[PDB]
Design an enzyme around this catalytic site. Structure first.
Site, PDB file in Angstrom:
ATOM      1  N   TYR A 112       0.841  -1.194   0.000  1.00  0.00           N
ATOM      2  CA  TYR A 112       0.000   0.000   0.000  1.00  0.00           C
ATOM      3  C   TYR A 112       0.873   1.239   0.000  1.00  0.00           C
ATOM      4  CZ  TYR A 112      -3.228   3.623   1.608  1.00  0.00           C
ATOM      5  OH  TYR A 112      -4.003   4.762   1.682  1.00  0.00           O
ATOM      6  N   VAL A 113       0.631   2.131  -0.959  1.00  0.00           N
ATOM      7  CA  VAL A 113       1.387   3.373  -1.127  1.00  0.00           C
ATOM      8  C   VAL A 113       0.471   4.525  -0.730  1.00  0.00           C
ATOM      9  CG1 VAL A 113       2.761   4.717  -2.723  1.00  0.00           C
ATOM     10  CG2 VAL A 113       2.623   2.252  -2.990  1.00  0.00           C
ATOM     11  N   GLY A 115       0.661   7.743  -0.458  1.00  0.00           N
ATOM     12  CA  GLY A 115       0.737   9.074  -1.034  1.00  0.00           C
ATOM     13  C   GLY A 115      -0.274   9.355  -2.124  1.00  0.00           C
ATOM     14  N   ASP A 156      -0.246   0.563 -20.122  1.00  0.00           N
ATOM     15  CA  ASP A 156      -1.249   1.361 -19.434  1.00  0.00           C
ATOM     16  C   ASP A 156      -0.631   2.546 -18.704  1.00  0.00           C
ATOM     17  OD1 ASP A 156      -4.108   0.653 -17.261  1.00  0.00           O
ATOM     18  OD2 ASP A 156      -3.917   1.948 -19.029  1.00  0.00           O
ATOM     19  N   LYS A 158      -0.266   6.069 -17.503  1.00  0.00           N
ATOM     20  CA  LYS A 158      -1.123   7.230 -17.310  1.00  0.00           C
ATOM     21  C   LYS A 158      -0.966   7.658 -15.857  1.00  0.00           C
ATOM     22  CE  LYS A 158      -5.204   4.354 -16.513  1.00  0.00           C
ATOM     23  NZ  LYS A 158      -6.622   4.202 -16.927  1.00  0.00           N
ATOM     24  N   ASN A 161      -2.028   5.531 -12.702  1.00  0.00           N
ATOM     25  CA  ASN A 161      -1.358   4.276 -12.398  1.00  0.00           C
ATOM     26  C   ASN A 161       0.002   4.471 -11.737  1.00  0.00           C
ATOM     27  OD1 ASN A 161      -3.478   2.756 -13.274  1.00  0.00           O
ATOM     28  ND2 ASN A 161      -2.554   2.168 -15.240  1.00  0.00           N
ATOM     29  N   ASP A 174      -0.978  -1.393 -11.368  1.00  0.00           N
ATOM     30  CA  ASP A 174      -1.938  -1.842 -12.352  1.00  0.00           C
ATOM     31  C   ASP A 174      -1.233  -2.415 -13.565  1.00  0.00           C
ATOM     32  OD1 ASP A 174      -5.206  -0.689 -13.554  1.00  0.00           O
ATOM     33  OD2 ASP A 174      -4.056  -2.530 -13.885  1.00  0.00           O
ATOM     34  N   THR A 191      -5.818   3.397 -22.658  1.00  0.00           N
ATOM     35  CA  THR A 191      -6.729   4.470 -22.333  1.00  0.00           C
ATOM     36  C   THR A 191      -6.634   5.496 -23.457  1.00  0.00           C
ATOM     37  OG1 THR A 191      -6.315   4.017 -19.985  1.00  0.00           O
ATOM     38  CG2 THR A 191      -7.248   6.182 -20.592  1.00  0.00           C
TER      39      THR A 191
END
Ligand SMILES: NS(=O)(=O)c1ccc(Cl)s1
Ligand SMILES: NS(=O)(=O)c1ccc(Cl)s1
Length: 340
Positions: A112-113, A115, A156, A158, A161, A174, A191
């Site tokens: 888990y990040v 920020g 992906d 973007k 992510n 992701d 995307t």
């Protein structure tokens, strides 16, 4: 390239291939965790903040509904995501800690990040200065050098992510569209604003699409908006394939030059896909101030440190309806997900 880089990448590939050939499976179970909060949600899954009940560690748990994965034709992609994530190791890639499945869902338990997404920070501040954008871009360049050497395409890139960690460095998350590809691949995914022309035109494409997407990302970081912006996808696609891009006058000449070479519609002329590969990017004047080794070693002081109170703080993520995580009494789609 320096023998040092060659030997680094050779070891990286050896270690990846060993895990690729013998993937880990079934390394935790759902009732080892407490549910804290929904951090994101999509058409076939969601990401939850969870806490391990014995260690107290927090994790981001991606939960995919097997039936929806099947319906939305994401089977192979979900198998790719987990097999790749369990096999990679690089400073700017989010670590997979556990994975498992049950009658209804697939689970990937990741660091888990706290920020939050780069997207939130970019939209809050408007646009990043060139040094700030360059710091993040350098991390993506190194990450793509690593991934591409393993024959992996990310597909992906973007701002949503890219998570910002406690030291202000990027962690790419992701891997839903990542794939091991020797040669070309054909799936329409990504995307819209970030798609390379050859994806839009339904060609067999290769890792050059990631370098195109880096051009889009750098432009968006430095401008505050992406280069091919429009109200509907087909209008975006017309701009992408056109071979035309306009730059804000505040962009440096070096930035414009790099972007023209990344946003090159002819993939055979695009930086990152020429005979000198990544070094055309690393040696470009826009990166002249970048100490590539210091970035890799995380020795550079970051442009900013997200504000958060501790490893369980969710303030940098947004609020979603809290829905049940239900597990059917009957196994669903067992055959399709045997290897997970
Ligand atoms: N308690 S439950 O709804 O089965 C659940 C357990 C652990 C989660 Cl994370 S969600
Ligand atoms: N020189 S660099 O590592 O790209 C960099 C560090 C801090 C920035 Cl702001 S840009």
């Amino acid at each position: 390239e320096q023998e040092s880089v060659k030997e680094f990448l050779a070891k990286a590939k050896e270690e990846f291939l060993k895990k690729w050939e013998s993937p880990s499976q079934n390394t935790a179970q759902l009732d080892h965790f407490d549910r804290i909060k929904t951090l994101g949600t999509g058409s076939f899954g969601r990401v939850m903040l969870v806490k391990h009940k014995e260690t107290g560690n927090h994790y981001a748990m991606k939960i995919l509904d097997k039936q929806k994965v099947v319906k939305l034709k994401q089977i192979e992609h979900t198998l790719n995501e987990k097999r790749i994530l369990q096999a990679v190791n690089f400073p700017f890639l989010v670590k997979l800690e556990f994975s498992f499945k049950d009658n209804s869902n697939l689970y990937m338990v990741m660091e888990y990040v706290p920020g939050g997404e780069m997207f939130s920070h970019l939209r809050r501040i408007g646009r990043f200065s060139e040094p700030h954008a360059r710091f993040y871009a350098a991390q993506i360049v190194l990450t793509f050098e690593y991934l591409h050497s393993l024959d992996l395409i990310y597909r992906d890139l973007k701002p949503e992510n890219l998570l910002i960690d406690q030291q202000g460095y990027i962690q790419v998350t992701d891997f839903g569209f990542a794939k091991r590809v020797k040669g070309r691949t054909w799936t329409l995914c990504g995307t819209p604003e970030y798609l390379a022309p050859e994806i839009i035109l339904s060609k067999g494409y290769n890792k050059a699409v990631d370098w195109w997407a880096l051009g889009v990302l750098i432009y968006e970081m430095a401008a505050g908006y992406p280069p091919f912006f429009a109200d509907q996808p087909i209008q975006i696609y017309e701009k992408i394939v056109s071979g035309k891009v306009r730059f804000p006058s505040h962009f440096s000449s070096d930035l414009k030059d790099l972007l023209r070479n990344l946003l090159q519609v002819d993939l055979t002329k695009r930086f990152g896909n020429l005979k000198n590969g990544v070094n055309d990017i690393k040696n470009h004047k826009w990166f002249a101030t970048t100490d590539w080794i210091a970035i890799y070693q995380r020795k550079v002081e970051a442009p900013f440190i997200p504000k958060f109170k501790g490893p369980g703080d969710t303030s940098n993520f947004d609020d979603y309806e809290e829905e049940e995580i239900r597990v059917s009494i009957n196994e669903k789609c067992g055959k399709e997900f045997t290897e997970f």
